[PDB]
C-alpha cells in the first residue's frame, strides 16, 4: 500500500530518551520509515524551544493534502543546518524513536510510504 494508517504516540520533549534517528539526512529518513513500520516511532509537537533540545538532522511529518477515517495525510521532510530535503505542508511535529516513554496523546496519520 502507498499509504498506511498509523496512530503515533505524542511525547513531551523532556521525556524523550533518544533525541534523533542518526547522523545524515538519508539515515534519519531511513530510520524514521523503519520505526514507523515497526510501531517504534513517537511524535513531538514543535513549539518555541523544542527543536534545540533534539538532535539534527530532524525528521518532520508535514500535511500532504487537505483526512481519511480521522487520519491526516502526511509525508516525511528532513532538515539539516536550515536546509530541508522534501517539500510539503504544515508541520504536525518532529519524529523521534519511541523506547517506552508515556505519551500525552495520539496523532492519527495516513503516512505516504
Swiss-Prot record:
**Encoding gene (name):** rep
Question: What's the domain of life for this entry?
Answer: Viruses
Role, per record: Inhibits host translation by associating with the open head conformation of the 40S subunit. The C-terminus binds to and obstructs ribosomal mRNA entry tunnel. Thereby inhibits antiviral response triggered by innate immunity or interferons. The nsp1-40S ribosome complex further induces an endonucleolytic cleavage near the 5'UTR of host mRNAs, targeting them for degradation. This inhibits the integrated stress response (ISR) in the infected cell by preventing EIF2S1/eIF2-alpha phosphorylation upstream of stress granule formation and depletes host G3BP1.
- The name this protein carries in UniProt is Host translation inhibitor nsp1
- Cellular location(s): Host cytoplasm
Segment of the intact protein contained: 11 to 125 of 7096
Give positions of region: Disordered. Answer: 1-113
What are the residue boundaries of the CoV Nsp1 globular domain, all occurrences included?
2-113
